[PDB]
User: What shape does this take?
Amino acid sequence: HHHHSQELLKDYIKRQIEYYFSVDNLERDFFLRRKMDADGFLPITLIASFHRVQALTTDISLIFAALKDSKVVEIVDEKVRRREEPEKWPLPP
RNA sequence: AAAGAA
Assistant: This one.
């Protein structure tokens, strides 16, 4: 027993989601950007369906917990966006 | 290139 399994899992979830919201990924992620609203937000439940997140967990409240203190993303209601200049990224649906 | 990290 060398770590708390659910805390480690939360760190994997957080870093996987922060990757999607990195500038490097966003520059090329046309699917993700077409799903943004005009303010840059995506449903957290959409992110939950992405294959690597769903592989790590199907517990939605755990994904919220994993993201609670992220400096990369901001959460409003059940939606999430890049904290820095989110409005640059949406693309037409 | 099956979501080859939507």
About this structure: The radius of gyration of chain A is 13 Å. Residues 44 and 78 of chain A are 6 Å apart (CA to CA).
